[PDB]
Amino acid sequence: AFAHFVLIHTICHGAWIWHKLKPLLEALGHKVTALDLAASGVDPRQIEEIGSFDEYSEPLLTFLEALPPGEKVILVGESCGGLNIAIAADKYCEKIAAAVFHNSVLPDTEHCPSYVVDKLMEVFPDWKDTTYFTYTKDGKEITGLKLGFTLLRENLYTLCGPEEYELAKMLTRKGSLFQNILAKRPFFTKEGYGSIKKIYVWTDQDEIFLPEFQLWQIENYKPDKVYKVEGGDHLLQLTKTKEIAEILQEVADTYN
């Protein structure tokens, strides 16, 4: 079967991270939308204009709003994209056939929104040459960051080619986890986010979202289906593009 996939990048990243997977999915006959979230990729906004993970998700929310009644899509989020998925699901669960997590955070409904993010910081505390800054928006102090080039090279693009890593150095922008804002945000709902089908894709060779963290998330919030890709790195859409497309095809044939 064919499906309409909506690819969601992580903070500091942009739609460009999906430049290899998107054409492959289309070669399978699927419809693919790869969005730039607020202040990401070529979006015109700067991070200082964004005050929460929800505002950061605007482009995704607006896209879903534009979907005619009856049209469903399969969301695919990488790394922190899982949070965008949760936010979107509490607003448009009926338009989501399923959500696919790609080495991504997996929020739940029993703990506050920042729960898995706080856990991630515990498992991976050293972000190496990543730099941080602060700005104020809507009366709150937000911590912004810019992923370090060494961190990118060693933990994210571990096995990616130098041509792919180059795009990261040229295109990655300042972003934020809005961690303190997530902590005070209303919990994700059981009726919205809790009701959607969730497929968890990962590899134990991920050098940033370590096995301890990912296995911890799976035990914390049981996915409907779990796919483990052998080898590759954190950026499976670059190092295991073909494998990811095959998994997404199966998801398309399973959930609608």
Add this chain to the structure above:
Amino acid sequence: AFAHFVLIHTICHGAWIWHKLKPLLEALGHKVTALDLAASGVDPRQIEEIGSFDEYSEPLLTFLEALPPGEKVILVGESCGGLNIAIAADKYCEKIAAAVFHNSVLPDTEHCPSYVVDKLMEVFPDWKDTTYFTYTKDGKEITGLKLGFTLLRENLYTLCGPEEYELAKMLTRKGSLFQNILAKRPFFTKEGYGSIKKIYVWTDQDEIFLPEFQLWQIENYKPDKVYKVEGGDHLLQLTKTKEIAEILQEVADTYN
């Protein structure tokens, strides 16, 4: 020998177009700077804020200004990047060891700045699905454009892979040729731009900067050296990356 190359993208493009060539040049021991011009790539400005090709060149001019006395670089421009080179040379000729034109416009000093651009429009009048718009800046009506996806696919990324073409669809932004502004701009000088060494690189398989146009430019303003690459397409830094690096190495060993 080693040199410091400054790669300059064309309008509607960004530094990302050099993601393959930059690491290759560095693997040869060179220092490489790939800039995002105004309102291009991840530059924060929008095209409506730019009123001339000179303002558009700001990032290049600012970069050259920051070069300590005695430090020279080799400029490499693609397509319309040749105009940025001419503008930069009339301000920092002493900091330019040489300029390399990569399937690029080659301005002269005998005709107005828009001369070769006007000729290009005559040789390649149909830009297919490219769209146009107008905005006003500093009392002038400027024609902006957004390269059509079909034009990109068929004439620019002719022989490039679908993964490279995807980046173009995801990253290309609105831009402008500032043609009417160039027409009224003071002529490029013989003492500045006219004095720098110019190396012309091209391929007769270019589907947008056609052989008629490029051979016309070579006859119009005789380059110090001409390199013709067999095969490939308009984007030789993607389809003939290795060949381009070898040519640039020879340039580095020739001009300093």
